[PDB]
Structures are given as C-alpha cells and as structure tokens.
Design a protein around this ligand. Structure first.
Ligand SMILES: OC[C@H]1O[C@H](O[C@H]2[C@H](O)[C@@H](O)[C@@H](O[C@H]3[C@H](O)[C@@H](O)[C@@H](O[C@H]4[C@H](O)[C@@H](O)[C@@H](O)O[C@@H]4CO)O[C@@H]3CO)O[C@@H]2CO)[C@H](O)[C@@H](O)[C@@H]1O
Length: 661
C-alpha cells in the first residue's frame, strides 16, 4: 500500500500480466518476509513524475523504455549497478534500449512488437499487402463481418503504417538521434496516413474505435483480422478462437515498420527500498521461474533473459513478432518522445475524423514535435529567485566546485536542503528554468560581485589573462580611462568641466540608449535582487564593477546589462582569451569572443564595439604583458623534489627543510 523502508510498491500497466507478477510477489513474501502489493492505476506514467517527487510514488515502475529517458534527466530514477556477470545473462541490445548517456536507468524484461493477427478459419489466406485489404472487405462485409479493427486512438497501432513509407520520429545517424530532424511531415508520412483515412471514409473502419471493442469484435468472430501485441493473446485463447500471427502487411511494396518496445523496470530514486528492488528483479522476477508466472497470465513476448528465451523461441507466434521487430525500428528513449506521441495522437484523431486535412495534421504535429526539441531561453527572474533563496556562502562555494574538474543533476549541500545544478545532455532540450553550470556562474556573479571581491575569486580562465593586475589598480585605472579624451567621438563640444571630450561622456550617451532599451524584464530582475540583500552595481566606476566578470560567466549577467559600459566590457576579457590561445598555438612549432557576443544578443543588445576598442588601447599591453603563458612544475616533481630534500635536510643538518620556491 505505502512506501516504507520495508514494504514494496510496484506499478505496472493494466494490459500487462499484473496478476502473474503479483504471484511472484507472494513468493518473495514467502522467502524473505517482504510483502509485495501490485497496483495498475490508469495513466500511471503521467501522474508518476507528480508523485515521484512528493514521497508518494511506487518504489518500482514498469513501462516500455521510451518514457525512462525523460525520467532519468529529471533525476527521478536510481542508478543501476548489476554484476558484470549479470549483464551477460541478458542480450546486450536490450541494455542499449535502457542505456542513456552511458548509464543504466532500468532493468529490461521483454521485447514487444505488434504483429498481424488473423482468424485462420475465416481467412486462411491472409493478405500480403495493405492495398489488397479494400477489395477483400467488400466480400466479407457481404457476410456480416469486417476485415480489420484496431485502436486508432493510440498512435502506436497506426505508426507502423505511417512508418511504412518512410516516416520516422527522429533520424538516427552516426550513433545517435538528431532531435531537430523530424520526419512526421515528409512525403512518406503523408502518403501512408492518407491510405488509412480513406479506409474510414469508405466505411471499412470507424474512427470511433478503441482497444476493448476491437479485441471483443475479433474475439466474437466479427472481424477477420486485428493488429495487437503479445499481451492480447491470453484473452483471445479464452474466447475460443483459432488465430494466426504473421508479418504485418506491406504498403507500397515496403515493409510495415512497427516501433519496438522493450518492457523495462525502473527504480524510484526516492525509494527507501533500492537494495530490495534490485534483489527482487534480478533474483525473483527476472528468472525462468519468475517470468513463466507472468507469461502464464498474459504473454510478455520475447524476454530479455537468454536462459528463458531459448524456451520461448519454440512458439511460432513469437518468431513472427521478432520478424516484425527486425523489419521495424527500436523506439528511442529520448525525453522528446512523449512530445512526439502526444503530437501524433492528436494528428491521427484530427485526421481520422476529418476535422482537418492530413497535410495540416502532420504539419501541426511537426511544429509540436520541435516545440520541445527547440532550445528555450532562460527566465532569469525564476533563476535569480531560486538562487537568492539559498544562503550566500553556499552559492559562492559552488562556483569553486564548478572549476575543480568535477567531471545527471549534480547535488550541492535543524533543517536540511539540497541545491541542484543541472548539466545539459546533448539529447535533452533546454528548459526555460534549467540552470546550466554556465548560467549558474552568470546569475551568481551578477548578484554577488562585492562578495566575490572579498574572497578574491579568480577562475583558471580569468587568472591566466592577468585579471588581478587590472583588479587591484581598478579604481585608479578606471578614472584615468574616464578622464581620458575620447577624441574620435562624440563631436567634442559635450562635457560636464574639461575643454576636451571625455570617455565618460560616451558611457553617458550609451546609458541613455540602454535606459531606453531597458526591458521591464530586466528592471524586474534588478529590484528583486536588492530586496534579497543582493546590493548591486550602478556604474563602471564601482568597487565591484569588474568583479562581475571574475567568475567567468558565459553571458553578461542579467543584473548589469543596461549599466554602461559593462555590456561592452565583457568582450574585452573574452577577446583576451582568444588572444592567448592563438599566441600559444603560435609558440608551438606545429571563439570565446564570438560565443560571448552571440549570447548577449540573445538578451537583446547591440554591443557598441567601439567601446571595446577604447578598452583595448588603454589596457591592451598591460593585460597582454601580464599574461601567464609559461607552464609550471608538475605535482610529481614538486612533491618528489621536496621529499628528497627533506631527507637530506633531515640527515645533514637536522633543521627545518624550507620549501622549493
Ligand atoms: O494524450 C492523452 C493520452 O496521454 C497518455 O498516453 C500517452 C503516454 O503518456 C505517452 O507515454 C505515449 O504513450 C506511448 C508509450 O510511451 C509507448 O510505450 C507505447 O505504449 C504502448 C506500450 O509500449 C505497449 O506495451 C502497450 O501497453 O500498448 C501501449 C500503447 O497503447 O505507445 C504509446 C503511444 O501510443 O503517448 C500516449 C498518448 O498517445 C495517457 O496514458 C492516455 O490515457 C491519454 O489518453
């Protein structure tokens, strides 16, 4: 019933052999004294992330592997660490389905694919091709029957036709899926779907048809054929029916291409029974003895366990199932898959009912598939508020951790709390509130510049470009910069009291512009920061105006963007990074600026690159001369060197050995 550090709660879909699985639980209770309660709620897969985080989900979730990539990125799933020996008991390709970013996120149980099921008494010559189905329907309809009924409400069942002439979710190439290359709106997808919609319009199928009616219809002897998976076989046997299982029909001479699912078992990251769950699955469920009990309720299909699979292989129906799988494609596990299914589902319904044209349906689906695929930009107001909540020292400490070569979510830590920095995988799509390590350096720096000054936090990216020499003499350096005459521009009759123009006049002219471009979004950020104790900058001549860049943010922080002339300051250091990297490459006998530039524009600014020029002419050589090009001693040298000395200094004469210098 309830998650407790003893008890186990398991969730599995209601179309699977949950009763047989419950039998395994009873066996588990007998040997170890641990009750196993099996439930099969509707829509378990949507609710789970909602309960997973609130202490109320199951310890173990069973589903096909496609949802699990999404679960793992959110950190909802416990890491799997089976013996090397154990991996070898199950087929390797099954691990691939449940492999994400090199990490195991669930145990595979069984491989499921759709097949064509036909009544051998009614239809001893099943069709080879889809396109013959229509001619076949007229004769049978004349005898009170139909050709084919299946669930149009789930895109899984229609996808094989849609995939038949070339449709794909995401293109697989060079070992991975291209999340921006979606094939739902290609020539192939439009052809395949059109064929199905006409079957309906010609009253061969009814758009208003789901899983339960059709099984019954087939089972009642009303329809010659159905499309379903191995789980359906149990109820058909009960209905007293002679059926066959064969390859799906072809379409346009191309094989039908079902999406193949691997039934998988994930462990809830918040479960207090992680050790128990692992013990349960490998030693009880994932056994010859265990799987038969499940299989005896409703067949699982082609199981992952080699020892058991050798037995199943004798069933001719599974041979056909695996035939369809090899002609099709293994489902992705990527997070965007759910977005994909939702899109195709609406598209099938909308098209099937004639509420929209096919072109539009699949076109809209295309848009929606990339909706999740495209990279959202940050809502800093939501990031700042999340960072400001945490105490100030905890945050500062985290920055020093990002730069120690740590290596999905990295965790930072009379009430306990947990800070989470989310690393971006190449597959996952940027969220509007996803705090990346880069965005993290950005927010904190813009919030706590003066507090960074106290700790003197210069990263190994800024330390090398001589950031200290500019920092200490900053206050005196910057005023020289301001008092200096900006000859080139503006036209010199504009000062407030030297006869010549000054650079200060430029930053002024600039601030007016920024004051106009100052977005309500930015203002909102600036004020919320102050109230949280995050006192901020207001001018370039501030004690901590330059300490905003000490942490090496990827962007000009959002709390300083419209305070001239910081926005252009950024490129100054960013270029220096490009300068060194090209100096070193030159030294040998044989991009940062561009990136930084791109990111600021993402915030809606046009960098007055002239200000950058000015910053150079003043602090060019100074910053360049004091670069740290040369390398230094190796840790082995230093440690080994000092030790040898110590000995000799311990021997003659026993005096404190002073270090190497
Ligand atoms: O849109 C409203 C509907 O949303 C919910 O269904 C969604 C799921 O949340 C998605 O995960 C996805 O479902 C896929 C599923 O991921 C995939 O594994 C496959 O499911 C098979 C399953 O592998 C197989 O073992 C067997 O159980 O049949 C399933 C198919 O019925 O295919 C699903 C897509 O068809 O997309 C659906 C929506 O399409 C919610 O559960 C629904 O109740 C709701 O109506």
């Amino acid at each position: 019933m309830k998650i407790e550090e003893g008890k186990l709660v398991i969730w599995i879909n209601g179309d699977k052999g949950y009763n047989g699985l419950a039998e395994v639980g009873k066996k588990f209770e007998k040997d170890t004294g641990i009750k196993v309660t099996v439930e099969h709620p509707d829509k378990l897969e949507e609710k789970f992330p909602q309960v997973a985080a609130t202490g109320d989900g199951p310890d173990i979730i069973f589903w096909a592997h496609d949802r699990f990539g999404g679960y793992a990125q959110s950190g909802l799933l416990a890491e799997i660490t089976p013996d090397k020996a154990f991996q070898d008991k199950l087929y390797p390709f099954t691990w691939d389905a449940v492999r994400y970013n090199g990490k195991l996120i669930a145990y595979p149980i069984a491989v499921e694919a759709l097949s064509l099921i036909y009544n051998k008494d009614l239809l001893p010559n099943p069709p080879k091709t889809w396109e013959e189905i229509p001619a076949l329907d007229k004769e049978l309809k004349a005898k009170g029957k139909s050709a084919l009924m299946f669930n149009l409400q789930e895109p899984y069942f229609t996808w094989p036709l849609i995939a038949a002439d070339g449709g794909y979710a995401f293109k697989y190439e060079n070992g991975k899926y291209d999340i921006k290359d979606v094939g739902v709106d290609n020539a192939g997808a439009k052809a395949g779907l059109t064929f199905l919609v006409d079957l309906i319009k010609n009253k061969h199928m009814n758009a208003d048809t789901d899983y339960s009616i059709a099984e019954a219809a087939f089972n009642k002897g009303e329809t010659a054929m159905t499309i379903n998976g191995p789980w359906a076989w149990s109820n058909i046997d009960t209905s007293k029916v002679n059926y066959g299982v064969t390859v799906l029909p072809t379409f346009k001479g191309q094989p039908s291409k079902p999406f193949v699912g691997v039934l998988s078992a994930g462990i809830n990251a918040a479960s207090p029974n992680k050790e128990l769950a692992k013990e349960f699955l490998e030693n009880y469920l994932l056994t010859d003895e265990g799987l038969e009990a499940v299989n005896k309720d409703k067949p699982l299909g082609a199981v992952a366990l080699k020892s058991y699979e050798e037995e199943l292989a004798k069933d001719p129906r599974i041979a056909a199932t695996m035939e369809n799988a090899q002609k099709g494609e293994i489902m992705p596990n990527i997070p965007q898959m759910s977005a994909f299914w939702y899109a195709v589902r609406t598209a099938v319904i909308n098209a099937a009912s004639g509420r929209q044209t096919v072109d539009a349906a699949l076109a809209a689906g295309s848009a929606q598939t990339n909706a999740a695929a495209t990279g959202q930009t940050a809502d800093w107001l939501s990031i700042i508020v999340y960072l400001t909540s945490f105490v100030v020292p905890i945050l500062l400490k985290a920055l020093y951790m990002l730069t120690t070569r740590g290596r999905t979510r990295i965790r930072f830590k009379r009430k306990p709390k947990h800070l989470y920095v989310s690393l971006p995988n190449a597959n996952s799509s940027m969220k509007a509130e996803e705090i990346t390590p880069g965005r993290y350096r950005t927010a904190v720096c813009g919030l706590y510049p003066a507090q960074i000054k106290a700790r003197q936090m210069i990263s190994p990216v800024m330390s090398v470009i001589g950031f200290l020499a500019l920092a200490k003499d900053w206050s005196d350096r910057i005023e020289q910069w301001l008092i200096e005459p900006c000859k080139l521009l503006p036209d010199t009759a504009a000062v407030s009291l030297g006869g010549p123009a000054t650079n200060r006049d430029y930053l002024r002219q600039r601030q007016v512009a920024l004051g106009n471009m100052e977005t309500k979004e930015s203002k909102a950020i600036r004020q919320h920061a102050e109230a949280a104790g995050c006192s901020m900058i207001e001018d370039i001549e501030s004690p901590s105006s330059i300490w905003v860049f000490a942490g090496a943010p990827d962007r000009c922080p959002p709390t300083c963007l419209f305070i001239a002339g910081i926005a252009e300051l950024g490129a100054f250091f960013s270029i220096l990074q490009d300068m060194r990297n090209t100096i070193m490459a030159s030294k040998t006998v044989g991009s940062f600026y561009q990136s930084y530039l791109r990111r600021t524009q993402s915030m809606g600014i046009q960098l007055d690159q002239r200000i950058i020029v000015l910053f150079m002419v003043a602090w060019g050589k100074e910053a360049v001369d004091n670069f740290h090009l040369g390398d230094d001693m190796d840790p082995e040298l230093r440690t080994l060197a000092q030790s040898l000395i110590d000995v000799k200094v311990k021997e003659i004469s026993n005096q404190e050995p002073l270090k190497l210098l």
